[PDB]
Homo-oligomer: 122 residues x 4
């Protein structure tokens, strides 16, 4: 699904995810969040299963964005873990973990959890 994953994706928050999938399983691109302490594009890197099951299963993948670029630094990183599903209604369904740099006293409240669904439209 190198061809299927590569391109521009949009989530339910209006965020924009631009990615190139390599033949080996590399994911590389940029992420632009429509919400939060973020502006403009951030580097993303990740991995995907380059030889997925051919029994109608989705393609497992994940990627990371560290929320530092030339404009801002939110001292945090989000990882998305999920699967790509092809076809007419192609989707990337994910759950994510956003961890912020904290003192040891605030480590217990360092990590947000959510879920994003990405589509080729919107």
């Amino acid at each position: 699904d190198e061809a299927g994953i590569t391109g521009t994706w949009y989530n339910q928050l209006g965020s924009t995810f631009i990615v190139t999938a390599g033949a080996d399983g590399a994911l590389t691109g940029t992420y632009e969040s429509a919400v939060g302490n973020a502006e403009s594009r951030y580097v993303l890197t990740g991995r995907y299963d380059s030889a997925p099951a051919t029994d109608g299963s989705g393609t497992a993948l994940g990627w990371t964005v560290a929320w530092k670029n030339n404009y801002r630094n939110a001292h945090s990183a989000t990882t998305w873990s999920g699967q790509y599903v092809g076809g007419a209604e192609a989707r990337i369904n994910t759950q994510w973990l956003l961890t912020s740099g904290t003192t040891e006293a605030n480590a217990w409240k360092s990590t947000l959890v959510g879920h994003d669904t990405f589509t080729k439209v919107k």
Copy 2:
């Protein structure tokens, strides 16, 4: 914390995490899991905050492993989200999401969640 993050790390399960941190915020290396449907080394890629807060806070980071290599393919990917804390007892404290490629009927049970703590010893 380019110097501090780069090197070999070990978690509570006995897994081995070897990483190089770039000046820009890149993480690159290999992961070897002591448990599960895995054998030998897998490529990992990630991001970290290359200019963290200097108020005693940890350094936010994340990385992904797709569980395909030359030996096995478990049709899944794990992302670790957490923070690096330096000093005598240097640690990377993480929470992770392991997503497997599934049919749409089994998507509800596609994602495991856990937490790993990595140290420079063990």
Copy 3:
């Protein structure tokens, strides 16, 4: 939101959630899962914020189901954590953690994570 929460709810999987909210913050009822190692109704108990913010915010709540009843025992428990939002399109948006009883060797893969959205219709 004692009145608003009390009643029958349905999620995206077709599962049925029947609950009574007490004036103090108690949640009590039964849960029927449309998927997984489950059949018929299971006891649920939980808590909700009985005096929520009046600034348009949702009402925080949570509940637990242990997957043992007279028909089956799946040796597991799911907790849903989320918020109730009233109005025309009333919803309970949740994230959940399903933990299974495991040996210490399999504890790392003991917990599934997902998200359910419940509505008054369907």
Copy 4:
């Protein structure tokens, strides 16, 4: 494990968890958090597997605390999902989800995730 679960438990943050396990699978008690927007005791309710596997597996359980009592209301609820393990070093290993009441615009950042381990000592 009705006998084993019932009593006072302490986590790594110094929080105190007092619970009575019923024969049917009920959990009832009070929770006192050593951290966060909390003071004194809060009602908790939950469920556990009252007939667990006898193959050395842990006992699945979960419970909820809504962070409202006579002293404070933090407009949030935490659910802990995990398993009880008996013996000399008896433990309750959990992962938790803390959801706060939010506006729809802030729903994406409504949920914290963490992990607590409870012991009979400390």
